[PDB]
Design an enzyme around this catalytic site. Structure first.
Site, short mmCIF file in Angstrom:
data_model
loop_
_atom_site.label_atom_id
_atom_site.label_comp_id
_atom_site.label_asym_id
_atom_site.label_seq_id
_atom_site.Cartn_x
_atom_site.Cartn_y
_atom_site.Cartn_z
N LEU E 86 -46.38 115.63 49.78
CA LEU E 86 -47.40 116.02 48.83
C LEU E 86 -48.32 114.83 48.60
O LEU E 86 -47.86 113.68 48.55
CB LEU E 86 -46.77 116.45 47.51
CG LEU E 86 -46.49 117.93 47.34
CD1 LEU E 86 -45.69 118.11 46.09
CD2 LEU E 86 -47.75 118.77 47.28
N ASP E 87 -49.61 115.09 48.48
CA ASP E 87 -50.57 114.02 48.44
C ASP E 87 -50.38 113.19 47.17
O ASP E 87 -49.77 113.65 46.20
CB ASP E 87 -51.99 114.58 48.48
CG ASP E 87 -52.41 114.98 49.89
OD1 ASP E 87 -52.02 114.29 50.85
OD2 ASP E 87 -53.14 115.99 50.03
#
Lengths: 61, 345, 128, 91, 345, 64, 133
Positions: E86-87
RNA sequence: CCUGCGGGUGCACGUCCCAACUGGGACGUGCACCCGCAGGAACAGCAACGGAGCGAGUUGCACGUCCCAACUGGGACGUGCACACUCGCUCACACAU
C-alpha cells in the site's frame, strides 16, 4: 407478430394469441430480435444491459 | 457467544462413522448418479492429461461445444450456422435440424467437434407450437379439438393440444410433438382438410429439439455476438461460457461405460472397448444399444454400441464390450498407453 | 391510467417521464409532425440518423419486447450526447404522431415554431 | 527521420493541452513515441495509453508549435511502424 | 452451553476449516487419532502468534514495509511479511503474516483487491451522469502504467460504482474492484482524461484484500500495541487473540482435502498426497488447482496442486491425489508413521 | 481529510464526502489515528476504552 | 441554529464528564479571558500533550466531537493520573470561536492568573463537582 | 480390420422512391441452398527414487529541542526505522493400517 407468451410460476412458457395474460400483464412476443451479422452495437448492448442486470453473466446458476 | 464456544470447543472430526455413501446425483453432466453405476474395478493409474467437461480452456471449450440458439425469424438455419462459424471463428460448424426460413426456436448448433454428433441428433424428438388459419369457419371449438385428436398417430405425432383458438379471426395456436423429419405444414394442411374447410400455417416456433428446450440455456444470436466481442476485448469468457455448453450435455440420456485412462487413446485410434479397461457401467445395457464411453473426468470418449449386457459385463473376464460408432475425442488428448499390458506383452 | 402503464413497461425504461412531462413530451411530438423532415419516426430511420450525427432529443416507448431491438440505442445516444427519455406506452406515441399505428421511437430536431417547448422538454429531461 | 509511417488512428477529443486520438491498429505504441502526420511531421509524443485492449485511446503532448485546437474531427494521425508492439506481448 | 458436545452444534458452524465438513465426500471414516497438534483456535499463545496473521488498517503516512517491521518490533517475532504493498499516503486493509504464516504470502498476491478513492476534476463537468458513464466505460481489461518500471500492464477492473460527487468542490468518490497490481492513481488519471476535463487521485483507501475486508476483524496498530502491552504487563492473551487470527483464515476459500493423522508428517517432509491417506475430499477439484490439505483437527498441512479430480478420486484406490506447492505445518509436528501400511513390505 | 463514512443497518461502511449523514448524525472519518511506535500511552488507552466499552475484547466475539 | 441538547448527542461515547450549558458558558468565558496572555493558554494536541507530559498544572478542555477517538483518548487518563481536572465541551467549533481563530481546536489548557482567578476558581470547582464516570 | 478426413431462389448490408418490432421497388456489396488420403491395428501396465525446508546471486517515516507563521502542513539540529532460473546445506525419498 401473432404469437405471444406469459410466464407461470415455473417459468414454463404459456403461449397465447392474447395481448394480456390472465394476470393483467402484457404478453411477451415469442420471437427474438431480427439479427444482422454486420452489427456493430455489441459494446452498447453490454453497457446498457449490464446497467439493469439483464446480462446472462448476471443471472444465477 | 457462539464465538466463545468456537474458541473453547474441541471441534474435531469423529474417529469413525461406519458409512461412506456418496451423493452423486448433483455432479455435472455424465457423472450424475455416478456411485449407482456397477463398479467393476477401482484399480488404475489416472493420467494428468485432459480436463473436466465444464472446466476446459477456452479454445478447447469452444472447439467442443454446442449452442441452443433462438433462431431469428427470417434466415435459413444454414445461414445461422454460417453466421456462428464467422463470429466464433471456428473451422467447422453444423447442426441437426433445419428450420424453415420463416420459423423460430431451438436450433442446436455444434461447434467444430460436436459436429460429429449431428448425425445422432437427426432422429431426436422435436416439439413445435404453430399458428394456423382456416379458409372457412367451423361449427364450434370442439370440432377443431376432435380434428386434432384424429391426427395423433402415424401420419408420427405423439401429442397435440389446442393452446388457443380465436373464432373471429379463425386463428388458433397448438402444441405438437413429432419425430424428426416431420413437416408440420403438411400436418396443418391435413388438419384443415380433415376439418372440412381447409387450412394453412402462418407461424411456427420449435419449442424443443431432443433434450434441449426453451428454458435449457437457450440464447439469442445477439448473445453469441456479444460473448465473442466481450472475449475479444475484455478477455472475459464468462459470457462465452454461459452461451456455449459442453458437448457432453447432449449425451446425458445415454447409458455410460467408464474406462481406464490407459484405454482412452486406444479407443480414439479405433480399438474396440475391451473388458480389461471398464471401470464402471450403467445397469440396463442391452445388445445393440447406443452407449457413451466416458473417462473418469466426465469426458465423452466416443459413442459405441454394446455387445454385452449389464449382467455379462458383470460376469465376464475377457472380450469386446462395445464396437465404436463415432470417435468424439481428438487423438493424442491422452498418451498412447496400449500395448504395455501383462497379457499383451 | 398512467401508473399501470408505467408498471407495464420494461426494466430498461429509465429515465422515465412523469405524467406531466409525458403530456409535454407528447405535445412536442404533435407539434413536430407538422414539418416533414424535422421529425424522424421508426427504428431504422432514427438509428441511421443518429449514426449520421443528427442532433435533437430521442424518445423511447418502454413497452417494447424483446428489448434487444432497442437495448443499444440508449447507449448510442449517451455516447453521441443526445438527450433522451422514455414514455409510458407506444399507442400514445402513435396517437400523438397522427398515426393509429404505434411508434416505438422518434427523434425531434429543433425548429423555431416550437422552440420554447423544445427547450423546456430538454431542460426537464436533463433534470432526470 | 521516419522511414515509414502508418495510420495509428483517428481523432478523439481534447483534454487541456492534450489530444486523445482513438487508436485503431491492434498494436500498442511505444511510450514517448513520436506521432507524425501524413507527411511525416512529428507533432508530439505519447504520454498515456488508456482503455481496453482492442478499442482504446492514446494521448499526445504537442511541444513543437502545434496546438490541440489546430486539429479537427476525423483527422488522422500516424506513427512509425518500428515503434509498435504486438498486442500479444502485453496480453 | 460450555460443556455441550461438539455434535450438538450444526456442522455449518465449525471453526474455519471444518465449516461444513459433512458436505464433503467421505472416502473413509476410519483412522487412528493421534495425540499431537492443536485445533487452530486452541493453540498455545506461543504458537498462535507464530501461526497467525493480522488485518492492519494502515495509518496515513508510513510505508507498508515500515508498518510490517513495526508489528515485528512490537510482537518480538522472527519474521513478518505482507501480501500487497500500500502506498505511503494510502490507508486501508493490509494482511500481515507472522512467522510461519509468511509462507502464504505468495499465495495471496493474486487476490482481488478493492479501493475507495477520491478524485478531483480540474474543470467542471455537466452532470453526474457524465461521470457515472465515464466510470462505466472504464471497465474490463485496461492498459495501465506504473506511476512515477515503465512497462505497460493490463489489469481488469471487474466493477466500479460512484458513491458521491460534490459539484462545487468538483471532487467525488468511486469504489473500484480490481485485480491485484491495479494502480488506482493511473485509473483516476485515465478517468479524468475520459470525462474530458482532467483529474487526479487525492486520497485512496483499500477496503478489501482478497477475502479479508474492513468488517472482517480489522484492527488498528494501536490495538496491536495495546495487545502486546496487555500480554507483557498483565498476562492477558484475550486481546492478542482478538487482534491476531490463525493462518487458516486465509485459506477458507481453497478446496479442501482432509488427510489421516498418519499422513500429516509425510506431507511435511515433501511427500505428495496419496489417495490411501484421504479421509474426505471436496467437490470441484480440478487438475492443476490449488487446494489446502487439512488435518482432521483443521490445521493446514500444506497447499497442494490437485492432480486428480473429484470423480477420479471417487473411482480409484491409490496414486497421487495432489503434488505440493508450499508446506505450512512445521516438520515433526506429528510423529513419523510412514512405512507401516497394510502391506509394509 | 475528505473521505468520511456512516454505517447502515448491516454496519456497512457507506462512503460520503459530506460532513453530516442522511439520518442526521455526523460522519466518522475514514482514516485510522496516526501511529508512532514510541507511544507510551497504552495503559491510558486501555483504561479509557474499558471505561466506555470500546476495547476489542469487549465487543462480541467474531464468528469464524 | 444548532441547539445545545442536540449538539451534545453528536459527541462520542467517550466525551464525559460533559459540561452542562451554564458551565459551558463559563468555560467559553474563561477561554476568551485567558487568551489575553499569549503564554498562559496552550492550544493543540501536540502542545497540550507536551505540557501535560512536562507536568503543567491547570484545567484542560476537550472537544466532544472528535473522530477517531484514538488521537486523544489517552489524554483523559493522563489528566486523571496527574490530577488535572478536565471537562468535555459540546463541540469543537465552539472552542475555536472561544479563541476567535475560526479553526476549531480539539483541546486547550487554561492556567491560573490573577486577572481571571475568580473565574478559574469558579470553573475548577464546578468541574470537580461534576464528577468522573 | 477399426478409425478419422475429403470428393437462380432466399437472406443480410449501404444508398434513393413512394405509399410498427413492417411489408413493396431499384441500384451495388456480400452469405446460404438449388471413391481417394492418413493413423492404428490396440486384451488397457506402472502401490514412490525427485519432493520439501533453509541461506546467496541473477528518499520517506517517528521521537525530541528549538524558529516561526486544527487530527496540520514547513525549517534546522541529533536520534533510530524501511527502501521465473541458478547456486550451496539439511530432511526424508513417504501408497498413510
Amino acid at each position: 407478430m401473432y404469437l405471444r407468451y406469459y410466464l407461470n410460476e415455473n417459468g414454463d412458457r404459456q403461449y397465447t394469441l392474447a395481448t394480456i395474460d390472465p394476470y393483467g400483464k402484457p404478453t411477451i412476443s415469442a420471437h427474438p430480435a431480427r439479427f444482422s451479422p454486420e452489427d456493430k452495437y455489441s459494446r452498447h448492448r453490454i453497457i446498457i444491459k449490464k446497467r439493469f442486470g439483464l446480462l446472462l453473466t448476471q443471472q444465477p446458476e | 457467544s457462539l464465538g466463545q464456544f468456537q474458541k473453547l470447543g474441541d471441534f474435531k472430526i469423529e474417529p469413525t462413522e461406519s458409512v461412506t455413501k456418496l451423493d452423486t446425483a448433483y455432479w455435472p453432466l455424465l457423472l450424475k448418479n455416478f456411485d449407482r453405476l456397477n463398479v467393476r474395478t477401482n484399480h488404475y493409474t489416472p493420467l494428468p492429461f485432459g480436463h473436466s467437461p465444464l472446466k476446459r480452456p477456452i479454445a478447447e471449450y469452444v472447439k467442443a461445444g454446442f449452442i441452443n440458439v433462438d433462431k431469428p425469424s427470417n434466415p435459413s438455419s444454414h445461414e445461422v450456422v454460417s453466421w456462428i462459424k464467422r463470429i466464433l471463428k471456428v473451422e467447422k460448424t453444423g447442426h441437426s435440424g433445419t428450420l424453415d426460413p420463416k420459423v423460430t426456436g431451438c436450433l442446436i448448433v455444434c461447434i467444430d467437434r460436436a459436429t460429429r454428433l449431428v448425425k445422432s441428433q437427426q432422429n431426436a424428438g422435436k416439439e413445435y407450437v404453430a399458428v394456423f388459419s382456416l379458409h372457412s369457419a367451423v361449427e364450434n371449438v370442439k370440432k377443431v379439438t376432435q380434428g386434432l385428436e384424429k391426427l395423433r398417430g402415424a401420419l408420427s405425432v405423439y401429442d397435440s393440444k389446442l393452446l388457443d383458438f380465436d373464432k373471429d379471426r379463425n386463428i388458433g395456436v397448438f402444441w405438437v410433438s413429432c419425430e424428426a423429419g416431420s413437416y408440420i405444414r403438411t400436418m396443418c394442411v391435413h388438419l384443415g382438410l380433415m376439418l372440412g374447410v381447409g387450412g394453412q400455417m402462418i407461424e411456427l416456433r420449435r419449442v424443443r429439439s431432443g433434450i434441449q428446450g426453451e428454458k435449457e440455456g437457450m440464447v439469442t444470436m445477439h448473445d453469441i455476438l456479444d460473448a465473442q466481442w466481450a472475449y475479444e476485448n475484455h478477455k472475459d469468457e464468462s459470457y462465452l461460457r454461459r452461451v456455449i455448453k459442453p458437448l457432453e450435455g447432449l449425451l446425458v440420456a445415454h447409458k455410460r461405460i467408464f474406462i481406464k485412462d490407459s484405454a482412452v487413446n486406444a479407443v480414439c485410434y479405433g480399438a474396440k472397448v475391451l473388458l480389461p479397461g471398464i471401470l464402471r457401467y450403467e445397469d440396463g445395457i442391452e445388445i445393440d444399444q447406443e452407449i457413451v464411453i466416458v473417462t473418469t473426468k466426465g469426458e465423452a470418449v466416443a459413442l459405441a454400441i454394446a455387445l454385452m449386457t449389464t449382467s455379462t459385463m458383470a460376469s465376464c473376464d475377457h472380450g469386446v464390450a462395445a464396437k465404436l460408432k463415432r470417435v468424439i475425442m481428438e487423438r493424442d488428448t491422452y498418451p498412447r498407453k496400449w500395448g504395455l499390458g501383462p497379457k499383451a506383452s | 391510467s398512467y401508473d399501470e402503464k408505467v408498471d407495464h413497461c420494461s426494466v430498461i425504461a429509465k429515465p422515465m417521464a412523469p405524467k406531466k412531462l409525458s403530456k409535454k413530451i407528447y405535445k412536442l411530438i404533435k407539434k413536430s409532425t407538422s414539418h416533414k423532415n424535422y421529425i424522424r419516426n421508426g427504428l431504422k430511420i432514427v438509428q441511421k440518423q443518429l449514426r449520421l450525427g443528427e442532433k435533437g432529443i430521442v424518445f423511447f416507448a418502454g413497452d417494447i419486447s424483446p428489448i434487444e431491438i432497442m437495448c443499444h440505442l440508449p447507449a448510442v445516444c449517451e455516447e453521441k450526447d443526445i438527450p433522451y427519455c422514455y414514455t409510458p406506452s407506444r399507442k400514445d406515441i402513435g396517437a400523438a404522431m397522427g398515426t393509429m399505428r404505434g411508434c416505438v421511437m422518434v427523434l425531434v430536431k429543433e425548429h423555431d415554431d416550437y422552440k420554447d417547448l423544445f427547450d423546456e422538454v430538454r431542460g426537464e429531461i436533463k433534470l432526470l | 527521420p521516419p522511414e515509414s509511417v502508418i495510420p495509428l488512428g483517428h481523432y478523439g477529443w481534447t483534454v487541456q493541452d492534450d489530444l486523445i486520438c482513438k487508436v485503431d491498429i491492434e498494436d500498442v505504441p511505444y511510450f514517448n513515441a513520436p506521432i507524425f502526420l501524413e507527411n511525416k511531421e512529428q507533432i508530439g509524443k505519447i504520454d498515456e495509453i488508456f482503455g481496453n485492449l482492442r478499442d482504446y485511446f492514446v494521448s499526445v503532448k504537442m511541444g513543437d508549435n502545434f496546438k490541440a485546437n489546430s486539429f479537427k474531427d476525423g483527422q488522422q494521425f500516424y506513427i512509425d511502424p518500428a515503434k509498435l508492439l504486438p498486442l500479444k506481448r502485453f496480453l
